[PDB]
Structure 1
């Protein structure tokens, strides 16, 4: 079965010219493959930017262009804007079906580095009555979107019962994540305190909660 091959990732500056390529594993691409470029942003539905190789969708900025070159389908962005930082998927029609590529992550440089803000919540009184206890560590407003989390029972590490989310992009183009530590009610009260440490770009941010 034919597969659609895209670049994994590209980086540009604001005002730069990007060219994304889309090739078939079986050979040459023509207008009979009706190449479709679909843009995906976090918290925004997919939207088709280019159809039938080169037809711009209504409202799509004219800096996006699609065409064929060297037997491959291509999408350029002439004068890229920060709002173009997104995932771009290619789809090719093979006579009887569409096949989507893996998508290209386009990064527009310029976003300044931001340290993570950490908020830690102890188990509520309601949950402790249900013989449960969970620590909620909330990490927000960090860029680039990558953090590591380590928990501490008093001053010693603890790995059992830790579940952390992948980083997700916020509306302000920064990233967020959360980490949950599950504990018995007895373990929560037998220790002096628990800590959630978030490491980002060599710096670590810490938050501490204590039984009340």
Structure 2
């Protein structure tokens, strides 16, 4: 069970939660340590740490563990920035990603 570099994938909030004034970030993590990592997030200027849920990992076809984190914040908080970044700690290594999600998609509106 050697070292495994985790993946980083940021996704926009769901319309279901958005409509109700809510946004939950999703961080896809695969091919990493055996359920051993550090959950961390980064916002526009103010970095995040607490208020994030972590679901138990799961072995893959290659025995590689896969997990994901969820950030609990308002829809306006994320909407303030163009894209979010998910910090993934591994073997003493931390990396973040940045990508702006589609706009055409439905967002927080007057239900």
TM-score, shorter chain, exceeding 0.5: yes
TM-score by length of 2: 0.73
In structure 1, C-alpha distance between the alignment counterparts of 2:72 and 2:93, rounded to whole Å: 26
State the Cα distance separating 1:206 from its structure 2 match.
1.6
2:95 corresponding residue in structure 1: 205
Higher relative contact order (CA 8 A, sep 6+): 2
TM-score by length of 1: 0.42
User: Which structure 1 segments of 5+ residues have no match?
Assistant: 1-110
User: CA 1:191–1:118 in 2, change beyond 3 Å: closer, same or farther?
Assistant: closer
State the Cα distance separating 1:166 from its structure 2 match.
3.1
Report the structure, 1 or 2, having the larger strand content: 1
Whose radius of gyration is greater, 1 or 2?
1
Partner SS, residue 79 of structure 2: helix
User: Which structure 2 segments of 5+ residues have no match?
Assistant: 102-111
Partner SS, residue 31 of structure 2: strand
- Across the aligned residues of Structure 1 and Structure 2, the Cα RMSD in angstroms comes to 2.2
State the Cα distance separating 1:184 from its structure 2 match.
1.2
Equivalent pair of 1:116/1:205 in contact (CA under 8 Å): no
Equivalent pair of 1:145/1:174 in contact (CA under 8 Å): no
How many residue pairs match? The answer is: 101
User: CA 1:176–1:168 in 2, change beyond 3 Å: closer, same or farther?
Assistant: same
Per-residue deviation, residues 51-73 of structure 1 (Å, max 9, x unmatched)? xxxxxxxxxxxxxxxxxxxxxxx
